[PDB]
Design a protein around this ligand. Structure first.
Ligand SMILES: N#Cc1cccc(N)c1
Lengths: 225, 1048
């Protein structure tokens, strides 16, 4: 009854953590903490012991009220705790570094995307501007006839030359952003990818390290941890 | 021999080294560059189609630039096709990718936030120039308003138009008894909650009297005159104003009767200012009840007020001038629908997984209410790891009429057991309409602390970020828009559901859900209920207790405070039960705000519950108490299902009713605008506030502009000026601060830490970069008050670019609350919760406490010459050096009073380990901690720790130099303060649990889920009885100290 394999609220949550698994005096006696559910001779149907009551229901709780009994060196199984705890904490930094890079790259990217919206908007306003000058510049060639003909139209065409070639530089500046956008977006897929491979092996490393620490405790621990 | 000759081949030497400063990165005054060059070329696109490129100075105004553009455009062709310059406005593409017209031509070329350096010239289209000052709004919010106008979603649009209801109603309260009521909005009286005084404050009064000092001003306003009244603590501003006029105007030419009349024609022309800051005493409270006075009493200070004429005050107040913006029986009931729930998974697209590493991937799914209404299910592990596509109707064992109003699907893609992505949808929309059709949910990546599969406390909705796992799906369509019942209808169904139970017969085993005791219950029951009612939120309730509660629900009206436990004991999957709970809540006795706040956390998502919770706040929550808990109330908006809701309408109103609340309500929202979990919601909310808040928008825009100067400034110091000497950096800093754009922007404005204080004029000699690698700026301002000298001639606050303040900010708040608890229950421990304010992503502001030093400075200064050792008395000696006379005795009282409190607060919270450079002591002998770090013991994942371990240094000082301090009465006293304090918090432990619970919203790594908070149970020992808990604390304190702490 004392040992019983499966036999406060905080650590029991951390032992039920991650559907069917189970384990003050003045409020009541023992508590069955089934995960899917805290459940208080030992309600109405009372008929002898704590080991009695659990073996019956292992074979469902629907008919009671309207669904896994999970539970020799000492010094060298204690070094392993230091070993797996250095591995586990090594692994955390790697998962933490990459969650920053991911989020920075999420921003760096989305910053780029905006800047492309910006460029494109800029370009519209420059494309709208060479359009703007062709209206008035070509009204101001024919209206003149001969006066200043090339001493005007050269310097009108010079301006117009600079306009569209400045457009040329912007468009190339945008393209050069877009190329790097994909390179960033590639690296972004790579950050996620490796996060997803570290993650499963992070939890197992964590889980073994708990069970290694469980088995020992069946103050000294802190130097290893 | 050292390393057993083991090589590490991989290891190569060619953000750990100088490992500080990790947030980043935000672009500045132009694209790709933090701070535009001091001279720069700008291409000016004209109306005539000509490009002229001006070389302008960085700092040049648009008035200056236009004036020169039109000079220099004569020299180009087609001059005659330009109108007089005055006929034009500027425009360019900005870094938010919008085309902003530039109306305020005083603005400088750097301050415009251009993308490419170019201006286009045009005539002002959209002749309401007046209306296109939501640049003002967009600037405050930091995203342009037009960005909402092109959002499709009706909820958003609907929020935008409907929330104006609130804005119009609040503005109607403002201009009610104006100008007084306007002054009351702007300068709302800064007043403690209660008029009743603690005994230790009272005893400083000699039978309830304080010497006060009323200053007054005389021609040509230069000469000022004191008038030191000694008046009652509980007399009001008007009584004080009279006495100060009595004294000012007694004379040898006025009889008493002549005086009395001169008092009456003067007494109501004036009001009381605080000398040194913009605080006022605008309404009838006991002087004591104003915060300024009470601090003056505690600090042993003489209040210094000013008589100010109301017309010089209603001079300064503007018109707030609110405007309405340009944006101004049927088909089905859910209970008819006779099927179970089934939802179709279709195809997740953008999933990034190593085929080498992972075997197989599937979609786990569930329905929830915070906790879940059916056995959780998955789907079969199909097209694994490589273009995954399932085409499965999932079948959830629950009838469609038994879905509660706030029911939510939570789902996630996983690995075999390991979550890749996640996302949760509301099964009903904001119009009550059951979700049917095809949805395109983009997912969220799992956080740090969350290892579990599904994450249901996570934000309801899709990610806006496109390039994420976009798991689309299909919902069952029932030939009609299926809607949730009316309340009138849920009422009727309950009235029937109760009357029906009254005829269910004799034996019902599974008594559980029904009384059988009838109008007469047992008295052993009635005391086991109030026994439950005492228990904190995290003492999880059993099925027996739940059912026990649920049956006796009608006697649970006797004990309103039980409600959270009762609400958690409803079967939210049984509409029969749920419909009855709605009918109790309908008229359940209102409860205290500190208890009603639990009901706005993640575990109470029902609209009716959250309704009742806001209803309590509307009644009991004072403007005082709201300010205290505003951080949690903003954070809890996240857990609301829809944008428009009662809590948003409550806060928005208070915010537009009280400008001191408004201020922090802006900044707390504005803080989190970086975070895509809330950018939409808070963006919209902030638009409302900003459109309705009167002239305070203009004041916010000045604060904002000043912060973004400092953000750019520190941002350069941390990129391009790393690897320079302080000397070089500091030269760069002062060079920059002297440019007129910085001079404009950083001089005339309000301290966001407290908008009562004004900042004017930088003293750049006292401005400096601290040593820290984060490159925090120590900034110093002149207090431009008429009575600066009476409070502080200089105001100085630290701005930190690298570091996340909101841990600190919460612990600081949590302290402030323990302090008030302790003091308002008559026991004096003086905590110094300094000012902290996060204003963005790892950007913030910290109040400087003048005259305080890290213990390490005490020891570095107390320089035992020659580097032999530091002496443990040096603190004691340094403190003696300051406090000499009977003063010394009182300073040790202060040290001993602070040291106790800080020991208990520290212990309970489990803040970072305390040490020389993070403990601080003040000249008058008060001690206080800084740089708290990880609050609820965040390194334990790698114990019930004691972070403040009182070394000799402290113990020496607690007793007055005595040897073997362990055994003085000086120490006995100190211990009993610790025990009395420890227990004080233990009677209020619900509140602290609750405050921490409300903060899970924020993406704080130290608050990921409730077991993080569970630490604060152990440390308070709430499972135990107080005398065991006492002994537990003594125990915990004794082992850390190695002697002392027994035989109470
Ligand atoms: N019982 C239980 C339980 C488990 C996890 C979370 C919450 N809120 C409750």
């Amino acid at each position: 009854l004392q040992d019983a394999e499966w036999y406060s609220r905080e650590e029991v949550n951390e032992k039920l953590r991650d559907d069917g698994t189970f384990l003050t005096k003045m409020h009541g006696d023992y508590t069955l903490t089934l995960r899917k559910k805290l459940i208080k001779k030992y309600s109405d149907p009372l008929t002898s012991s704590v080991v009695e009551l659990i073996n019956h229901y292992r074979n469902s709780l629907a008919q009671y009220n309207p669904v896994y009994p999970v539970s020799d060196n000492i010094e060298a199984v204690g070094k392993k705790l230091h070993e797996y705890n250095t591995q586990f904490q090594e692994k955390s930094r790697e998962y933490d570094r990459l969650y920053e890079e991911y989020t920075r790259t999420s921003q760096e990217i989305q910053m780029k995307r905006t800047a492309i919206e910006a460029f494109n908007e800029t370009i519209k306003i420059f494309e709208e501007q060479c359009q703007t000058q062709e209206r008035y510049s070509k009204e101001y060639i024919e209206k003149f006839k001969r006066e200043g003909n090339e001493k005007e139209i050269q310097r009108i065409m010079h301006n117009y030359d600079k306009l569209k070639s400045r457009i040329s530089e912007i468009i190339d500046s945008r393209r050069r952003l877009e190329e790097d956008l994909k390179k960033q977006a590639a690296e972004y897929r790579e950050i996620d990818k490796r996060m997803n491979s570290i993650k499963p092996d992070l939890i197992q490393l964590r889980k073994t390290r708990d069970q290694y620490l469980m088995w020992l405790t069946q103050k000294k621990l802190n130097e290893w941890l | 021999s050292y390393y057993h000759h083991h090589h590490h081949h991989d290891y190569d030497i060619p953000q750990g080294a100088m490992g500080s400063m990790p947030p980043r990165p935000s672009s500045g005054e132009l694209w790709g560059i933090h701070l535009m060059p001091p001279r720069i070329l700008v291409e000016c696109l004209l109306p005539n189609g000509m490009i002229v490129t001006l070389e302008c100075l960085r700092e040049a105004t648009l008035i200056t630039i236009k004036h020169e553009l039109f000079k220099e455009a004569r020299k180009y062709p087609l001059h005659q096709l330009l109108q007089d310059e005055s006929s034009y406005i500027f425009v360019s593409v900005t870094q938010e990718a919008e085309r902003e017209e530039f109306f305020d031509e005083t603005r400088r070329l750097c301050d415009l936030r251009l993308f490419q350096p170019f201006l286009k010239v045009i005539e002002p289209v959209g002749n309401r120039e007046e209306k296109i000052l939501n640049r003002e709004i967009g600037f405050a919010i930091g995203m342009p308003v037009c960005e909402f106008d092109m959002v499709k979603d009706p909820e958003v649009q609907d929020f935008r138009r409907n929330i104006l209801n609130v804005c119009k109603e609040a503005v109607d309260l403002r201009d009610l008894n104006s100008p007084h009521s306007r002054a009351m909005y702007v300068y709302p009286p800064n007043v403690e909650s209660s008029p009743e005084l603690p005994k230790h404050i009272y005893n400083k009064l000699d039978k309830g009297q304080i010497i006060v000092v009323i200053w007054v001003i005389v021609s040509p306003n230069n000469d000022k005159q004191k008038y030191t009244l000694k008046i009652n603590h509980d007399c009001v501003p008007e009584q004080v104003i009279a006495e100060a006029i009595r004294k000012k105007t007694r004379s040898m030419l006025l009889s008493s009767e002549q005086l009395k009349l001169c008092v009456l024609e003067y007494q109501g022309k004036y009001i009381l200012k605080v000398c040194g800051c913009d605080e006022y005493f605008l309404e009838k409270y006991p002087l004591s009840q104003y915060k300024y006075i009470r601090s003056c009493i505690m600090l042993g200070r003489m209040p210094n007020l000013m008589l100010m004429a109301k017309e010089s005050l209603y001079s300064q107040l503007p018109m707030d001038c609110f405007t309405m913006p340009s944006y101004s029986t049927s088909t089905k009931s859910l209970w008819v629908i006779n099927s179970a729930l089934r939802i179709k998974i279709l195809c997740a697209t953008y999933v990034n997984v190593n085929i080498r590493d992972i075997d197989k991937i599937y979609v786990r799914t569930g329905i929830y209410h915070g906790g879940e209404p059916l056995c959780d299910n998955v789907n079969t592990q199909r097209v694994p790891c490589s273009n995954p596509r399932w085409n499965e109707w999932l079948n959830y064992d629950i009838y469609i009429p038994d879905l509660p109003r706030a029911a939510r699907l939570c789902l996630s893609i996983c690995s075999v057991h390991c979550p890749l992505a996640w996302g949760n949808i509301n099964l009903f929309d904001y119009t009550d309409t059951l979700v049917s059709g095809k949805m395109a949910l983009n997912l969220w990546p799992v956080p740090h602390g969350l290892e579990d599969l599904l994450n249901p406390i996570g934000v309801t909705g899709s990610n806006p970020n496109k390039e994420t796992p976009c798991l689309e799906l299909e919902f069952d369509w029932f030939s009609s828009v299926v809607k949730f019942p009316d309340m009138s209808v849920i009422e009727e169904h309950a009235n029937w559901s109760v009357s029906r139970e009254a005829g269910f017969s004799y034996s019902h085993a599974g008594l559980s859900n029904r009384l059988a005791r009838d109008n007469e219950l047992r008295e052993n029951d009635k005391e086991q209920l109030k026994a439950i009612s005492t228990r904190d939120p995290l003492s999880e309730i059993t099925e027996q207790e739940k059912d026990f509660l649920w049956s006796h629900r009608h006697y649970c009206v006797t004990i309103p405070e039980i409600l959270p436990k009762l609400l958690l004991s409803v079967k939210w999957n049984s509409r029969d039960e749920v419909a009855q709970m709605y009918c109790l809540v309908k008229d359940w006795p209102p409860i205290k705000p500190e208890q009603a706040m639990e009901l706005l956390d993640c575990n109470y998502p029902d609209p009716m519950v959250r309704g009742f919770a806001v209803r309590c706040l509307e009644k009991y929550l004072t403007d005082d108490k709201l300010s205290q808990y505003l951080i949690q109330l903003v954070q809890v908006l996240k857990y609301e299902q829809y944008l428009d809701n009662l809590l948003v309408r409550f806060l928005l109103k208070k915010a537009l009713t009280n400008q001191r609340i408004g201020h922090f309500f802006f900044w707390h929202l504005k803080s989190e605008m970086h975070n895509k979990t809330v950018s939409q919601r808070f963006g919209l909310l902030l638009e409302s506030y900003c459109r309705a808040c009167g002239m305070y928008l203009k004041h916010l825009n000045r604060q904002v502009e000043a912060m973004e100067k400092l953000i750019n400034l520190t941002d350069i110091l941390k990129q391009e000026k790393k690897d320079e000497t302080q000397k070089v950096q500091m030269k760069f800093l002062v060079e920059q601060m002297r440019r007129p754009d910085f001079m404009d922007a950083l001089q005339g404005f309000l301290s966001p830490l407290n908008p009562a204080h004004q900042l004017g004029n930088l003293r750049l000699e006292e401005c400096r970069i601290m040593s820290s690698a984060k490159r925090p700026l120590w900034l110093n301002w002149e207090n431009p008050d008429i009575m600066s000298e009476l409070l502080f001639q200089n105001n100085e606050i630290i701005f930190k670019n690298g570091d996340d303040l909101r841990q600190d900010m919460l612990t600081l708040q949590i302290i402030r609350i323990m302090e008030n608890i302790w003091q308002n229950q008559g026991l004096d421990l003086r905590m110094l919760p300094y000012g902290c304010l996060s204003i963005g992503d790892c950007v913030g502001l910290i109040e400087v406490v003048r005259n305080s030093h890290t213990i390490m400075q005490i020891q570095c200064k107390g320089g035992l010459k020659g580097a032999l050792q530091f002496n443990s008395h040096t603190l004691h000696q340094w403190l003696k050096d300051k406090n000499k006379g009977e003063i010394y005795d009182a300073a040790i009282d202060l040290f001993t009073r602070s040291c106790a409190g800080y020991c208990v607060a520290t212990f309970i919270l489990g803040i970072g380990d305390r040490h020389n450079s993070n403990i601080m002591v003040k000249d008058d002998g008060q001690l206080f901690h800084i740089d708290f770090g990880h609050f609820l013991d965040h390194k334990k994942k790698k114990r019930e720790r004691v972070p403040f371990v009182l070394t000799q240094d402290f113990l020496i000082v607690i007793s007055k130099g005595a040897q073997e301090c362990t055994k003085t009465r000086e120490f006995e006293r100190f211990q009993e303060m610790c025990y009395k304090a420890y227990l004080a918090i233990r009677q209020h432990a619900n509140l602290f649990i609750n405050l921490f619970s409300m903060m899970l919203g924020s993406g704080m790594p130290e608050l990921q889920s409730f077991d993080d908070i569970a630490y604060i149970r152990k440390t308070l020992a709430l499972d135990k009885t107080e005398q065991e808990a006492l002994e537990y604390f003594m125990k915990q304190m004794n082992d850390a100290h190695h002697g002392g702490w027994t035989t109470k």
